[PDB]
Design a protein around this ligand. Sequence first.
Ligand SMILES: O=C(O)c1ccnc(C(=O)O)c1
Ligand SMILES: [Mn+2]
Length: 210
Amino acid sequence: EQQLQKEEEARKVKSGIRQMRLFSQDECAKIEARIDEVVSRAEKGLYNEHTVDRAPLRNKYFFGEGYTGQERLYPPGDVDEIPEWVHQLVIQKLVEHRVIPEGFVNSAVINDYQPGGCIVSHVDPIHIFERPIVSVSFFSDSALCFGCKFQFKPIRVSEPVLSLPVRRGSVTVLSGYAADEITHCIRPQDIKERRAVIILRKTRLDAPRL
Ligand SMILES: O=C(O)c1ccnc(C(=O)O)c1
Ligand SMILES: [Mn+2]
């Protein structure tokens, strides 16, 4: 049956996921206030054009490096640099906890979700980003789904291969099978209240530029 295939796939996805709670209630509160500062600055028109991407239920803020399966890296300096508080409050903690080495992160993206927000099935562009992919969830708890046939064929398949809880203050690290061989997504029903995520990545040298 398809039950053995779904279990073997989930096994493979799991081996590409590492997760741990690194940030306390207070550390989150400090970072969450800084994320609110970023939303204000965007609204004040203080950022470069390509720094901010506005969409109905979700907003994206690109720092260090940003982009538009033919994604392209904007020319150097076209997006705002990674704010100091990100280096100080987020990247440092990860470096101290041996999640990623120092100097690795050149790209930080903040996704800001409304309740009812979602991300459609995708693979983090392999031509743009190196692995691993690190992400830290903030305002509330949610879930990350892997294997996303269901978003398009809910008749033939009603569930993802795997759902991963992403609680406030947790660090999720994706590599191998989980980052390369399978799509991920977030379902609208899994975002009940406001949610933000900071995604920390290194871009590839040969990432096709504009
Ligand atoms: O919101 C998230 O946690 C999340 C998870 C996986 N991918 C993305 C993305 O923006 O690519 C965001
Ligand atoms: Mn992603």
